[PDB]
Amino acid sequence: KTFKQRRTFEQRVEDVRLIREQHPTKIPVIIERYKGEKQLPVLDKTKFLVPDHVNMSELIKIIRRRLQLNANQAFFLLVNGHSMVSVSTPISEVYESEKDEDGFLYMVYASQETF
Ligand SMILES: CC(=O)Nc1cccc(NC(N)=O)c1
Ligand SMILES: [Cl-]
């Protein structure tokens, strides 16, 4: 059902290596809806190539637009399984510290802070 369940560790590593070769300025991001989530819709895809200069605040705005949310729908994003300490960090810096061993950066979204 989840990305890590659909693709082998070998397959995920090789896909991150191809993104380094073909899209060297992009961060490879996996974005999934929390398995408990009732309110927010599912995304149209799972794997996102994010420009490495955007900060987490801008990436939250990007995901809100992709989900076509309105002003008063709540949205919380986990990175590497936990809350973001800051939304001001460039995603290139977030990637270096929070990347998975497969080389993806894993994010999960919910309408509650309580995941
Ligand atoms: C055994 C082997 O190929 N290793 C390796 C390690 C890091 C990066 C890459 N290539 C890449 N396109 O990111 C390949
Ligand atoms: Cl690129």
mmCIF file with all atom_site columns, all heavy atoms in Angstrom, residues 23-26, ligand 2:
data_model
loop_
_atom_site.group_PDB
_atom_site.id
_atom_site.type_symbol
_atom_site.label_atom_id
_atom_site.label_alt_id
_atom_site.label_comp_id
_atom_site.label_asym_id
_atom_site.label_entity_id
_atom_site.label_seq_id
_atom_site.pdbx_PDB_ins_code
_atom_site.Cartn_x
_atom_site.Cartn_y
_atom_site.Cartn_z
_atom_site.occupancy
_atom_site.B_iso_or_equiv
_atom_site.pdbx_formal_charge
_atom_site.auth_seq_id
_atom_site.auth_comp_id
_atom_site.auth_asym_id
_atom_site.auth_atom_id
_atom_site.pdbx_PDB_model_num
ATOM   1  N  N   . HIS A 1 23 ? 18.022 14.914 -12.855 1.00 0.00 ? 23 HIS A N   1
ATOM   2  C  CA  . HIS A 1 23 ? 17.405 16.115 -12.256 1.00 0.00 ? 23 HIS A CA  1
ATOM   3  C  C   . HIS A 1 23 ? 18.307 16.515 -11.110 1.00 0.00 ? 23 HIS A C   1
ATOM   4  O  O   . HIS A 1 23 ? 17.835 16.538 -9.985  1.00 0.00 ? 23 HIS A O   1
ATOM   5  C  CB  . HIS A 1 23 ? 15.966 15.849 -11.804 1.00 0.00 ? 23 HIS A CB  1
ATOM   6  C  CG  . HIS A 1 23 ? 15.094 15.377 -12.914 1.00 0.00 ? 23 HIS A CG  1
ATOM   7  N  ND1 . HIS A 1 23 ? 14.595 16.246 -13.846 1.00 0.00 ? 23 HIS A ND1 1
ATOM   8  C  CD2 . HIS A 1 23 ? 14.644 14.138 -13.239 1.00 0.00 ? 23 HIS A CD2 1
ATOM   9  C  CE1 . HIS A 1 23 ? 13.879 15.560 -14.726 1.00 0.00 ? 23 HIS A CE1 1
ATOM   10 N  NE2 . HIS A 1 23 ? 13.910 14.260 -14.380 1.00 0.00 ? 23 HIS A NE2 1
ATOM   11 N  N   . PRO A 1 24 ? 19.581 16.840 -11.383 1.00 0.00 ? 24 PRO A N   1
ATOM   12 C  CA  . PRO A 1 24 ? 20.576 17.034 -10.327 1.00 0.00 ? 24 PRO A CA  1
ATOM   13 C  C   . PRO A 1 24 ? 20.206 18.138 -9.323  1.00 0.00 ? 24 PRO A C   1
ATOM   14 O  O   . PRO A 1 24 ? 20.662 17.996 -8.157  1.00 0.00 ? 24 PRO A O   1
ATOM   15 C  CB  . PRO A 1 24 ? 21.883 17.338 -11.072 1.00 0.00 ? 24 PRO A CB  1
ATOM   16 C  CG  . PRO A 1 24 ? 21.400 17.854 -12.432 1.00 0.00 ? 24 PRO A CG  1
ATOM   17 C  CD  . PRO A 1 24 ? 20.184 17.009 -12.724 1.00 0.00 ? 24 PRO A CD  1
ATOM   18 N  N   . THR A 1 25 ? 19.395 19.135 -9.694  1.00 0.00 ? 25 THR A N   1
ATOM   19 C  CA  . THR A 1 25 ? 19.069 20.273 -8.779  1.00 0.00 ? 25 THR A CA  1
ATOM   20 C  C   . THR A 1 25 ? 17.804 19.985 -7.951  1.00 0.00 ? 25 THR A C   1
ATOM   21 O  O   . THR A 1 25 ? 17.393 20.889 -7.186  1.00 0.00 ? 25 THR A O   1
ATOM   22 C  CB  . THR A 1 25 ? 18.914 21.610 -9.506  1.00 0.00 ? 25 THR A CB  1
ATOM   23 O  OG1 . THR A 1 25 ? 17.686 21.655 -10.259 1.00 0.00 ? 25 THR A OG1 1
ATOM   24 C  CG2 . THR A 1 25 ? 20.106 21.912 -10.375 1.00 0.00 ? 25 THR A CG2 1
ATOM   25 N  N   . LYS A 1 26 ? 17.197 18.799 -8.078  1.00 0.00 ? 26 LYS A N   1
ATOM   26 C  CA  . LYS A 1 26 ? 15.910 18.494 -7.411  1.00 0.00 ? 26 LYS A CA  1
ATOM   27 C  C   . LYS A 1 26 ? 16.135 17.589 -6.203  1.00 0.00 ? 26 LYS A C   1
ATOM   28 O  O   . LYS A 1 26 ? 17.020 16.699 -6.242  1.00 0.00 ? 26 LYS A O   1
ATOM   29 C  CB  . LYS A 1 26 ? 14.938 17.827 -8.383  1.00 0.00 ? 26 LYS A CB  1
ATOM   30 C  CG  . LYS A 1 26 ? 14.573 18.670 -9.602  1.00 0.00 ? 26 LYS A CG  1
ATOM   31 C  CD  . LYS A 1 26 ? 14.040 20.053 -9.286  1.00 0.00 ? 26 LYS A CD  1
ATOM   32 C  CE  . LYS A 1 26 ? 14.168 20.981 -10.480 1.00 0.00 ? 26 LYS A CE  1
ATOM   33 N  NZ  . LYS A 1 26 ? 13.311 20.514 -11.579 1.00 0.00 ? 26 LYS A NZ  1
HETATM 34 CL CL  . CL  B 2 .  ? 17.748 19.610 -12.449 1.00 0.00 ? 2  CL  B CL  1
#
